Symmetry: D3
Subunit: 61 residues, 6 copies
């Protein structure tokens, strides 16, 4: 299983390490996928490249 | 955050329900993100559309 | 530019035709890109493959 | 609806803001999707990471 | 490395087998990556879900 | 056909140019796709954003 986590910049390297651990475990225990088969990709987003309702987060409070 | 889980066809509806819940909790507890801001997408693959080492899974023997 | 619109199943063929046209015009008028260089991909999701707050849409009540 | 716009580096922050506005509007008026449900991601490409006909744009005139 | 080939429906099972093999060899010989570390995903598109210049392929005449 | 090659940072610009050439050729000769229709995107991954078996590559030897 390939897991892509897309989130905003701002997380610490420690939070990223924990995210990978926990997400990998969640997948392993709910899909029966072997541990060495679970891959996780982290993709960081910039506020000026992310919008909701036509307004970029960099343009909001 | 946005999480995309890409895995082979086969999981039951129940397993998918658990996958979504566990993965959401993993993200919430590890990044601080609030539940209503955590989106999960599930993408299923066919054994004849996934390959490793030049051999599609549907062609392994 | 390449635009991928990911949305739930349900739109009619007509709506998709309009989506492609309007989105292409939006890109052309806003980035300066020429029409023949604007590609649009449509990706449909199933309600049981999309979740928010740990609950797939097919499980909301 | 989730819209990912993948385009080359080179656009101004103003063009990006306009792109988001227009694209969000195009989606809203052709799919009946509510405004607060339309998300837009902008992904920028580097010329040396983009190719057509086997030739990267960074290797063209 | 992970290679995703996105193309229109239509190729035969044989062509896909060859695509996977050739693409894997191209990656191996050009990046130095070992075969067991080269994954290939095939994604098929529908003519009514792919557009260029504001016209879906299923609408071209 | 759209080919996305996702690999770790570390390759030379020459290896990237060769990758594009070879991959484009592999696709052309196995799918019957015209040369000017084959697009290749290179996406580089950071070791601290890539994990296998719950362990990020930046956390391995
Ligand atoms: O925080 C994240 O990582 C994120 F991907 C999205 C988000 C969207 C809307 C908000 O109000 C807050 C966060
Ligand atoms: O301009 C863009 O944003 C783009 F994504 C592609 C492109 C491709 C070929 C061209 O000749 C010009 C632009
Ligand atoms: O090398 C690459 O480009 C890559 F995408 C992955 C990888 C994964 C596991 C390894 O042990 C080595 C490389």
């Amino acid at each position: 299983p390939y897991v892509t986590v897309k989130m905003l910049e701002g997380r610490t390297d420690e939070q990223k390490r924990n995210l990978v651990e926990k997400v990998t475990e969640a997948v392993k225990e709910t899909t029966g996928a072997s541990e060495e088969k679970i891959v996780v990709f982290i993709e960081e987003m910039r506020k000026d490249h992310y919008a909701v309702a036509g307004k970029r987060l960099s343009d909001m409070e």
